[PDB]
Write a protein that binds this DNA or RNA. Structure first.
Ligand SMILES: [Mg+2]
Ligand SMILES: [Mg+2]
Ligand SMILES: [Mg+2]
Ligand SMILES: [Mg+2]
Ligand SMILES: [Mg+2]
Ligand SMILES: [Mg+2]
Ligand SMILES: [Mg+2]
Ligand SMILES: [Mg+2]
Ligand SMILES: [Mg+2]
Ligand SMILES: [Mg+2]
Ligand SMILES: [Mg+2]
Ligand SMILES: [Mg+2]
Ligand SMILES: [Mg+2]
Ligand SMILES: [Mg+2]
Ligand SMILES: [Mg+2]
Ligand SMILES: [Mg+2]
Ligand SMILES: [Mg+2]
Ligand SMILES: [Mg+2]
Ligand SMILES: [Mg+2]
Ligand SMILES: [Mg+2]
Ligand SMILES: [Mg+2]
Ligand SMILES: [Mg+2]
Ligand SMILES: [Mg+2]
Ligand SMILES: [Mg+2]
Ligand SMILES: [Mg+2]
Ligand SMILES: [Mg+2]
Ligand SMILES: [Mg+2]
Ligand SMILES: [Mg+2]
Ligand SMILES: [Mg+2]
Ligand SMILES: [Mg+2]
Ligand SMILES: [Mg+2]
Ligand SMILES: [Mg+2]
Ligand SMILES: [Mg+2]
Ligand SMILES: [Mg+2]
Ligand SMILES: [Mg+2]
Ligand SMILES: [Mg+2]
Ligand SMILES: [Mg+2]
Ligand SMILES: [Mg+2]
Ligand SMILES: [Mg+2]
Ligand SMILES: [Mg+2]
Ligand SMILES: [Mg+2]
Ligand SMILES: [Mg+2]
Ligand SMILES: [Mg+2]
Ligand SMILES: [Mg+2]
Ligand SMILES: [Mg+2]
Ligand SMILES: [Mg+2]
Ligand SMILES: [Mg+2]
Ligand SMILES: [Mg+2]
Ligand SMILES: [Mg+2]
Lengths: 64, 201, 117, 144
RNA sequence: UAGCGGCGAGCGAACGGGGAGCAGCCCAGAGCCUGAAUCAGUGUGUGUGUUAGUGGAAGCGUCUGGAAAGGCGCGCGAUACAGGGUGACAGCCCCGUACACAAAAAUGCACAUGCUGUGAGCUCGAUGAGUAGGGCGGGACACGUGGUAUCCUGUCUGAAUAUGGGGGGACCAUCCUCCAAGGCUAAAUACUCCUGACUGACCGAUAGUGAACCAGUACCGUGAGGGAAAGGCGAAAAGAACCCCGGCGAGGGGAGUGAAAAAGAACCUGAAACCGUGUACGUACAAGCAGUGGGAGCACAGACUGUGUGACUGCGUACCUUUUGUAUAAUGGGUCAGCGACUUAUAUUCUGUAGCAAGGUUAACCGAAUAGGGGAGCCGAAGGGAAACCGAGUCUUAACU
RNA sequence: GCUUGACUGCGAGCGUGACGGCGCGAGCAGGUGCGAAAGCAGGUCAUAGUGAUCCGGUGGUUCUGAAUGGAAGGGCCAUC
């Protein structure tokens, strides 16, 4: 039967123009006041999935 | 494209695409193979170790007897056990793209014209529904193994054919690539050729 | 598509057994053993084609030594003399000559001695 | 051309791996699974995104965003699709009849993609700046 | 997909579209006109099946052979060359097949018709109360209580009643849509203990059913229950009269049958393990994976080389598995024969290959059926953004060098 | 002594990690502090002082809002 998607992965990843995946950075969720503003700013924008974990993401998201 | 007729010795114009294209062997082969696969029926089944009739109790205790460790009497490695990968009934029908099928037909038709196995005539009717008459007509036409393709459906012709196993009479709608390749010669009526051209385009 | 495998299996076994004819006991009667034996024989044969070359050279050298000493010269000296004299006769031939033609061998030895000194 | 003269193209059919048929085969005793592990086992292996236990990437990283229901009912049209309709008026209904946009599509946009040669009247559709310019150049008309 | 979900593992719609099939009615009720349509049972007539059946074409000569259906000649039938038998492979020898016919009787399904019950149409009405909601506890909806709509109810309550009420995914207003608390209803859908016909890139006696055979038997178990093994003489018994050895044996040798009995019922073929008889060569001073390289002699077969044996001699510690590493005194195997393990379906990606190409392809289904229709859909030709939205750009930011 | 640069948006380019990430960073825009000015300031001589995701809480919002207008809920930003 149809392959099922890993719904968590679906929530966390979105495919881009060539077939990458952007994702939201970790560590910008709670205790923030100790984190430096520069660090927070850098974490804020989205980020492409690296070469190492691309395969795993692909496995997770067969219909992405 | 132009096919001269046997009976009137008059030409008949046809499409170069339909009757004068190249023979794409790979495509034709795929279509014929597909036809064969479709024709098969595929009804069989073995019994898995699940389905083999017997109890599901352990033939002997795991340890102690010194025998090798057995779990079910229905094991595939046991005599009268299940077939390991027992078959089920399956559908062997391959899909063939419409265009691919049409192209294959076109190639086969072209090959026939080149090889002089397509014989076009104005009309191939028999007067009575008599095998003897059909046989005589075929002899007169020199023919023995032949696919007679007709435009309009003929009762006398079909009945006459029925008992000649080398002979087969079809309607132009019901032609098939394996049949065309198989039969030594193919005798199309003028209406039939025209109809085929219309069908194939 | 139930491919019964009697005929092929027996033919295969028979070929191996035939190859293992002349072996003691189950090594010529019982397939498992015969096959093991056949493989072993193959391995030995490969080894021994090499060893055959080695052995025959050894034999030739022994014979030549005996002959040369009979004509009053050691093998090593004789070979050196021949090399010096530019005689390219290989020692299979030298051994044969020694065995079957004492005059020829003696002549060769004389040549070697002269070349040596 | 007989039923015993046809043959496939070279490279069309390839040999099907058969595991565990002796030494010469290549795929011998073990069948290309190496030596006894979990992956070696029949049924063996670990589910998608499993990292030995490490929090897997699809969990490490935070969830984000939401799904728009209006996006499911929006659509994007091309100038080649402005030519693919019939007539000289591009409504939703006309586009749908043409089979360009989906049936449950309340909104559509004409984007500068491809090119429009014939004059077309885009009615009740959003049109991008490039597309609008292109249509006007073609000799078209846009109206709300 | 949207959603649900220790937001894990997993579960997973609906709206809308294409098809198959399409049938709508009745009571909560009385006045009128009233046997009025429909439905059910029951007789009768007709048609068409079903349960026995009838007819059903056309070939001989010759060779081989135990036997012709085979070879080689010359003919004939075919709306019949499906299939099965007959001394080897038969269109024409037999049974059939195509095709054309057949029912005293019983009965299925159609109409036609008679009888019985059944009640149509109009006007006026009436419009399902411990019910809908609610509180508490559970359950069902893709929906795990969550912001949770909707459905069911164990418990405690409890309306309005068309000037009315339900729903539109917390909730309110507006708008739209429908009328709960009473019923009936064919088709398209599911299945095969069983009956008939036909088919198979299904098996062919360790296979296929457990069971080709007197099998759910023998046997095992107190019992529920478990549960085998075991097919083949020959074309035809022509199954061996008679004689002989032997215990008026068993078994055998003649005889006879037969194409063949080394086809004799312990019966087609008749492998291997295993066990013998005969012949050649070797072997009783010689130490080990038993072979291999060299190699004398001896025997045989042909005119020296083939074959068989192998004195003596160099080298040489099986195989598998598992291991850093095995001759290992680590595992497994007494041997032989048969069987015994990377499959199948559906999704997805990449590679090859074929078709068409900014297009490609159809799914159910329909179909004088692998044709043709069917483009509902799906993938692609546009991306960016969480989204609104913008768009060859877009997002970020007040703005970006 | 005077102050709040213990700024906001970004950031060429590097370092270090299998990755999650972590680190250094001139310069640009806005707005400030000290200095006469050149200048310096995006915490502390540097290297420890820490905890992913989920699920919620609080505030803001030119996003969304299941007939429509709202709202709930969701998103985004800050934070617990
Ligand atoms: Mg936050
Ligand atoms: Mg039990
Ligand atoms: Mg079985
Ligand atoms: Mg089709
Ligand atoms: Mg390999
Ligand atoms: Mg290998
Ligand atoms: Mg592998
Ligand atoms: Mg192993
Ligand atoms: Mg290991
Ligand atoms: Mg491994
Ligand atoms: Mg398993
Ligand atoms: Mg469409
Ligand atoms: Mg009869
Ligand atoms: Mg007959
Ligand atoms: Mg004959
Ligand atoms: Mg015979
Ligand atoms: Mg009511
Ligand atoms: Mg209630
Ligand atoms: Mg409620
Ligand atoms: Mg209700
Ligand atoms: Mg609402
Ligand atoms: Mg047998
Ligand atoms: Mg059995
Ligand atoms: Mg049996
Ligand atoms: Mg007695
Ligand atoms: Mg007797
Ligand atoms: Mg026999
Ligand atoms: Mg026998
Ligand atoms: Mg034997
Ligand atoms: Mg001795
Ligand atoms: Mg000894
Ligand atoms: Mg010899
Ligand atoms: Mg030796
Ligand atoms: Mg190893
Ligand atoms: Mg060890
Ligand atoms: Mg060793
Ligand atoms: Mg051992
Ligand atoms: Mg082992
Ligand atoms: Mg053992
Ligand atoms: Mg694949
Ligand atoms: Mg491909
Ligand atoms: Mg100043
Ligand atoms: Mg410090
Ligand atoms: Mg979690
Ligand atoms: Mg939770
Ligand atoms: Mg909030
Ligand atoms: Mg709004
Ligand atoms: Mg709304
Ligand atoms: Mg809100």
């Amino acid at each position: 039967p149809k392959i099922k998607t890993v719904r968590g992965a679906a929530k966390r990843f979105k495919k881009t123009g060539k077939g990458g995946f952007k994702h939201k950075h970790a560590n910008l969720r709670h205790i923030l006041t100790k984190k430096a503003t520069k660090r927070k700013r850098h974490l804020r924008p989205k980020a492409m999935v690296s070469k190492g974990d691309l395969g795993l993401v692909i496995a997770c998201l067969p219909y992405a | 494209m132009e096919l001269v007729l046997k009976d009137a010795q008059s030409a008949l114009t046809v499409s170069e695409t339909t009757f004068g294209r190249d023979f794409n062997e790979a495509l034709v082969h795929q279509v014929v193979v597909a036809y064969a696969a479709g024709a098969r029926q595929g009804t069989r089944a073995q019994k898995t170790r699940a389905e083999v009739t017997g109890s599901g109790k352990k033939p002997w205790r795991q340890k102690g007897t010194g025998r090798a460790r057995s779990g079910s009497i229905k094991s595939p490695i046991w005599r009268s056990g299940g077939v390991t990968f027992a078959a089920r009934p399956q559908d062997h029908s391959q899909k063939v793209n419409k265009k691919m099928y049409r192209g294959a037909l076109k190639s086969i038709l072209s090959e026939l014209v080149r090889q002089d196995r397509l014989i076009v005539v104005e009309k191939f009717s028999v007067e009575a529904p008599k095998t003897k008459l059909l046989a005589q007509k075929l002899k007169d036409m020199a023919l023995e193994d032949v696919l007679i393709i007709t435009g309009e459906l003929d009762e006398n012709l079909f009945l006459a054919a029925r008992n000649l196993h080398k002979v087969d009479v079809r309607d132009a709608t019901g032609i098939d690539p394996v049949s065309l390749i198989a039969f030594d010669k193919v005798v199309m009526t003028a209406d039939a050729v025209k109809q085929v051209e219309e069908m194939l385009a | 598509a139930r491919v019964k495998r009697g005929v092929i299996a027996r033919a295969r076994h028979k070929k191996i057994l035939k190859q293992a004819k002349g072996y003691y006991g189950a090594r010529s009667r019982v397939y498992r053993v015969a096959f093991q034996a056949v493989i072993k024989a193959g391995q030995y044969a490969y080894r021994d084609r090499r060893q055959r070359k080695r052995q025959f050279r050894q034999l030739w050298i022994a014979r030549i030594n005996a002959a040369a000493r009979q004509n009053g010269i050691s093998y090593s000296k004789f070979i050196n003399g021949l090399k010096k004299a530019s005689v390219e006769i290989d020692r299979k031939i030298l051994a044969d000559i020694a065995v079957f033609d004492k005059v020829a061998f003696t002549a060769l030895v004389e040549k070697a001695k002269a070349a040596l000194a | 051309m007989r039923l015993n003269t046809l043959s496939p193209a070279e490279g069309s059919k390839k040999a099907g791996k058969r595991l565990g048929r002796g030494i010469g085969s290549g795929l011998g005793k073990t069948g290309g699974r190496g030596h006894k592990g979990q992956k070696s086992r029949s049924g063996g292996g670990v589910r998608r995104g499993f990292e030995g236990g490490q929090m897997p990437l699809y969990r490490r990283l935070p969830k984000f965003g939401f799904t728009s229901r209006k996006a499911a009912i929006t659509a994007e049209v091309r100038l080649s699709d402005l030519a693919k309709v019939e007539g000289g008026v591009v409504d939703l209904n006309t586009l749908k009849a043409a089979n360009i946009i989906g049936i449950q599509i309340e909104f559509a946009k004409v984007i500068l993609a491809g090119e429009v040669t014939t004059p077309v009247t885009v009615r009740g559709l959003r049109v991008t700046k490039g597309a609008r310019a292109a249509i006007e150049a073609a000799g078209g008309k846009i109206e709300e």
